[PDB]
Structure 1
Amino acid sequence: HHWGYGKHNGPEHWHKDFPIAKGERQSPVDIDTHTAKYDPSLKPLSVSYDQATSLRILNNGHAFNVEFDDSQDKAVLKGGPLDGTYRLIQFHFHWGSLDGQGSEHTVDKKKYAAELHLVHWNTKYGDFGKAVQQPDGLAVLGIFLKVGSAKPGLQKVVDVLDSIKTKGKSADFTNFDPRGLLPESLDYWTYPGSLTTPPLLECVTWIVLKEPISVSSEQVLKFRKLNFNGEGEPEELMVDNWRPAQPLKNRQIKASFK
């Protein structure tokens, strides 16, 4: 009776094993666009993915992670609200059973079909396991997905999902360029928060891009064919792997843009 996204083990249950679920800086949150303040002092955001080295794709039983070589400064996030250098370790998505839900963050209560999380760790802490124990350990770039035109740069991801249908399956996934998942504009909102999955650690500087990317209905349908279960277990479609918005408490959301 491990955590998940079902009636008996979903987000409303997580606080029993993970009391930080009711903490002071939980994610996601609703972004109230009229309350977010422009912060002219945010430095420009720097997303440097030219030398990124993807390795593998893994179905971990709650999402799929595209993993990178993070043993050198190859793919880094800098600038914006951040002090120092954050290294890309993985990306994953959260998505819905239907196009009208799936994102974790909301914008004026609007839900997107899905949300991409590009996860980076602060190099001053040496490794990801140490970084998640620090209040400035991670920087996550959050990107909304809406259903419309296909995203060409997503198709290589979509096409390998049949090979990692069930929990614990992985596949080689080299030479994937995450620049093909970014929208035109880097305008963003930022606030201090948490992992959206257990263990819900309060270690994340969230950087949520305002401009969504468009994916096709056929692309997100292939996400929804994944399974939460292992091979030879009863089939449970991997859908609605999102946590709903949490109380903002004593936080301010800052905007990079007027």
Structure 2
Amino acid sequence: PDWGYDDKNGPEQWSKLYPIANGNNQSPVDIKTSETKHDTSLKPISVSYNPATAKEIINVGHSFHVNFEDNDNRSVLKGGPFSDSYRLFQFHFHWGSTNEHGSEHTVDGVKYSAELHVAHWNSAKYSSLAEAASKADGLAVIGVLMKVGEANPKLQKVLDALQAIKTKGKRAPFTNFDPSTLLPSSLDFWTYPGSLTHPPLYESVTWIICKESISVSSEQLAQFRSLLSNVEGDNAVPMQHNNRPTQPLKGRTVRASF
């Protein structure tokens, strides 16, 4: 593709092909907790996912995705800031080249070692992801900051699957999996209107950022960085990082549920 995370094709240069990279609703952001506004109309987040909607795991060159069947409302996110039901379609991670950084969102300047994104589309209003993806109210993404520490057992099925999708474009069945098992036990959150965090960078996402982190070990992070961005039979090029820097808030308000 014309974009990636290298020096030449990376975030700093994305605006050349994708001008919205310099938009007013870009993500991720730094959440400054002294500038959050507690909002009492925010309802609790409700997730209800059916593990039979898990579909496939794919290496996309810059990351890997776990996609879900989204033909119906078997797996849905509701509550929080939403009046609409949002249908689960994918989860994935971001990571950095070492443990020091790797999250996309930061909290009061603090960088975590990775970040989980659980992505949903507005099926009350739209008929497909493709329709929803560019609408201001189209997408809802839960982000969970991942703090290097104890190995997290709940990552296991994901990590065990990586050996079948080592290189760009490989894909395999990934079934019977409920990604609510990856979320932290408190679902207290921050929410703000923003964007996809890589091209096409659409400003279509209501972000739900969990206040509590989940763990990951330094060895489970290495399993992500050992995926390869090349296709089979080319020079091996590890996927060292895929996090975008934080972007200017431009007057947006981050709301706290707590």
The two structures have a TM-score, normalised by structure 2, of: 0.97
Letter of the aligned partner of 1:21 in structure 2?
Answer: A
Shift of 1:177: 2.0
Residues 140 and 205, structure 1, Cα contact 8 Å, conserved in 2: yes
Letter of the aligned partner of 1:89 in structure 2?
Answer: F
Task: Give the corresponding residue for 2:170.
Answer: 169
Alignment of 1:59-98 (within 5 A): 59-98=59-98
Task: Give the corresponding residue for 2:116.
Answer: 116
**Which runs of 5 or more structure 2 residues have no equivalent in the other structure?**
none
Task: Give the corresponding residue for 1:255.
Answer: 256
Q: Distance in 2 between matches of 1:2 and 1:142?
A: 26
**Which runs of 5 or more structure 1 residues have no equivalent in the other structure?**
none
Q: Distance in 1 between matches of 2:52 and 2:120?
A: 12
Residues 96 and 242, structure 1, Cα contact 8 Å, conserved in 2: yes
Q: List per-residue Cα deviations over 1:77-113 (Å, max 9, x = no partner).
A: 0110112110000001000121111000000111100
Task: Give the corresponding residue for 2:240.
Answer: 239
Residues 192 and 206, structure 1, Cα contact 8 Å, conserved in 2: yes
SS of the equivalent of 1:125 reads: coil
Task: Give the corresponding residue for 1:45.
Answer: 45
Task: Give the corresponding residue for 2:209.
Answer: 208
Residues 140 and 208, structure 2, Cα contact 8 Å, conserved in 1: yes
Query: Over aligned residues, Cα RMSD in angstroms?
Result: 1.1
Q: List per-residue Cα deviations over 1:128-180 (Å, max 9, x = no partner).
A: 01001210000000001111122211111001111111110101101122122
Letter of the aligned partner of 1:253 in structure 2?
Answer: V
Letter of the aligned partner of 2:156 in structure 1?
Answer: Q
Shift of 1:51: 5.1
Q: Does 1:22 find its partner at 2:27?
A: no
Q: Distance in 2 between matches of 1:177 and 1:50?
A: 6
Q: Distance in 1 between matches of 2:112 and 2:172?
A: 28
Task: Give the corresponding residue for 2:103.
Answer: 103
Q: Distance in 1 between matches of 2:257 and 2:142?
A: 14
Q: Distance in 1 between matches of 2:207 and 2:76?
A: 15
Shift of 1:52: 5.1
Q: Distance in 2 between matches of 1:202 and 1:139?
A: 11
- Choose 223-232 or 182-191, whichever is displaced more: 223-232
Q: Distance in 1 between matches of 2:19 and 2:212?
A: 34
Task: Give the corresponding residue for 1:194.
Answer: 195
Residues 44 and 187, structure 2, Cα contact 8 Å, conserved in 1: no
Q: Does 1:228 find its partner at 2:229?
A: yes
Residues 139 and 204, structure 1, Cα contact 8 Å, conserved in 2: yes
The share of aligned pairs that are identical, in percent, is: 60
Q: How many residues matched?
A: 257
Shift of 1:216: 1.9
Q: Distance in 2 between matches of 1:59 and 1:234?
A: 16
Runs of 4+ in 1 over 3 A off after TM superposition: none
Task: Give the corresponding residue for 1:150.
Answer: 151
Q: Distance in 1 between matches of 2:49 and 2:137?
A: 21
Letter of the aligned partner of 2:141 in structure 1?
Answer: V
SS of the equivalent of 1:33 reads: coil
Residues 225 and 241, structure 2, Cα contact 8 Å, conserved in 1: no
Shift of 1:217: 2.0
Residues 95 and 242, structure 2, Cα contact 8 Å, conserved in 1: yes
Residues 51 and 176, structure 2, Cα contact 8 Å, conserved in 1: no
Aligned CA distance change for structure 1 residues 52 and 34 (closer, same or farther; 3 Å):
farther
Shift of 1:23: 0.6
Letter of the aligned partner of 1:189 in structure 2?
Answer: W
Task: Give the corresponding residue for 1:182.
Answer: 183
Shift of 1:50: 4.0
Q: Distance in 1 between matches of 2:180 and 2:23?
A: 34
Q: Distance in 2 between matches of 1:171 and 1:95?
A: 22
Shift of 1:233: 2.1
